[PDB]
Amino acid sequence: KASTLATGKGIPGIDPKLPTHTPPASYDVLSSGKARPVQVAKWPPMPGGVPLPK
Amino acid sequence: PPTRLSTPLYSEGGAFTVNWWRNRYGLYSRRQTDPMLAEFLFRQQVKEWFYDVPSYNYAALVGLALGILVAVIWRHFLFNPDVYVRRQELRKMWPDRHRQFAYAVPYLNPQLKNLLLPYKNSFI
């Protein structure tokens, strides 16, 4: 299984080593070293992603 | 027509071909009991019937006769005023069958009648 190119080596999905998708993994600290802030929403998001003033 | 079973027979793809015919020829056969014998009998029938030149003439005739037969049957149902399949007009008295009467005049004047009627003077 996926031993040779004919068997599917290097083909994502068919090859066990390669995943079908490569979504970024989650992290608990920012690269700066600050803790990642957490925001629990209770209303739908803004129509255009417009941020509100501080 | 090959004479050696080793030489394959050319076949096209579709619903009426050499391969299609081979699959179904021996379905009801008690004589095609093994590959060698089955192929020999299959090619024997194909050679005798499909490689016979005059046989194709009858194939044309059956096609023409059936084509006319289907057309006349279909034309009566579709266009003949006297033929009823729907029931709306049959539930009314004759004077009220307006929709059915629409077929009358056009059905009375087919193209061929107009073309050939002027040739009555070849007889009278």
Binding site: - | R30, L90, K92
Partner: protein, 230 residues
């Protein structure tokens, strides 16, 4: 070695059956006809006995020969119904505007379709058991109940109908087409009453014949239902 076919030299049922047929013509009482019909049933059974005894010949083509005979018989039954449909539709232009009450499209058609569908399901289960070399006693009695209801419903319908064969060609064709179907239902009773388990199984022509015949009757009713009720 042996001959390919074990020839049958003599037979005397043919004379008896033919004479039984003649008795119908030469009767002076309808009571003789009733008893004559029993004789015909007896002698036909003897002929069926000869077919079962022919199994001793161990001839592979016997099954095929009888199966194709049934196919021809089925075609004749279909063509007989076609003639009745032909008769019905020839006078189609004279229907639906005469002062007669045609049948309703709600009650009779639905229950009959449901009832006859159950009959098909019972026979299908019989075929499945025959494939599996298995038997279920209750199945036969479901058919008898099914046939009992069909007889009870058809008898009442004829008696309570307010129009008669002499009223119009429409009524004649309705009654005749329905009777022709009933006769074929009754012929099914004649066949199914002997259903049993035989241990030689899939070389028994009776099972395939019954499955084909019951399917034919039911499909014919669908055509009748569309023509007359719907």
């Amino acid at each position: 070695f042996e001959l390919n076919i074990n020839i049958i030299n003599y037979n005397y049922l043919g004379i008896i059956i033919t004479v039984i047929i003649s008795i119908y013509i030469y009767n002076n009482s309808n009571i003789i006809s009733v008893y004559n019909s029993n004789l015909l049933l007896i002698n036909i059974n003897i002929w069926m006995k000869y077919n079962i005894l022919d199994m001793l010949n161990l001839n592979v083509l016997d099954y095929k020969i009888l199966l194709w005979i049934v196919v021809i018989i089925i075609s004749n039954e279909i063509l007989l119904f076609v003639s009745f449909y032909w008769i019905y539709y020839h006078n189609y232009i004279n229907y639906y505007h005469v002062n007669i009450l045609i049948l309703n499209s709600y009650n009779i058609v639905y229950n009959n379709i449901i009832l006859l569908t159950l009959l098909s399901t019972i026979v299908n289960i019989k075929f499945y058991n025959y494939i599996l070399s298995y038997y279920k006693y209750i199945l036969s009695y479901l058919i008898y109940y099914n046939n009992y209801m069909f007889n009870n419903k058809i008898i009442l319908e004829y008696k309570n109908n307010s129009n008669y064969t002499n009223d119009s060609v429409y009524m004649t064709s309705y009654f005749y087409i329905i009777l022709l179907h009933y006769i074929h239902i009754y012929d099914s009773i004649i066949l199914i009453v002997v259903y049993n388990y035989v241990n030689y199984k899939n070389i028994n022509n009776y099972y395939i014949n019954i499955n084909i015949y019951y399917h034919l009757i039911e499909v014919l009713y669908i055509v009748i239902s569309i023509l007359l009720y719907l």
